[PDB]
Amino acid sequence: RKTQPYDVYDQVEFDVPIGSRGDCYDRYLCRVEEMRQSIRIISQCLNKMPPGEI
């Protein structure tokens, strides 16, 4: 979503969690932070929906 973006993901600002040890703990923390960033992207989407066709 940050290097080879698709449809409108380049118009949305969000963070990318990065682990530091490779354990399962860092991956679980990364998934929780990805949930928080998903909430952030959902807010940005709800405040920026344009009119038009589908």
Next chain:
Amino acid sequence: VKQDMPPVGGYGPIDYKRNLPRRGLSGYSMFAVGIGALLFGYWSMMRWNRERRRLQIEDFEARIALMPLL
């Protein structure tokens, strides 16, 4: 036209960061509470064990008085 659109002022702020409260006493406080409870229990057990020893001595001397007839 009518369509699904956000309102004129937009939607409100949405919280998305972590919020831990950070609560409870300092560790010195629970250590002092535990030490005080330990001291209170020690004092009460001391008093009641001394009273129990006195009662046991009384019962034993009653037994010693009762022995010769038996």
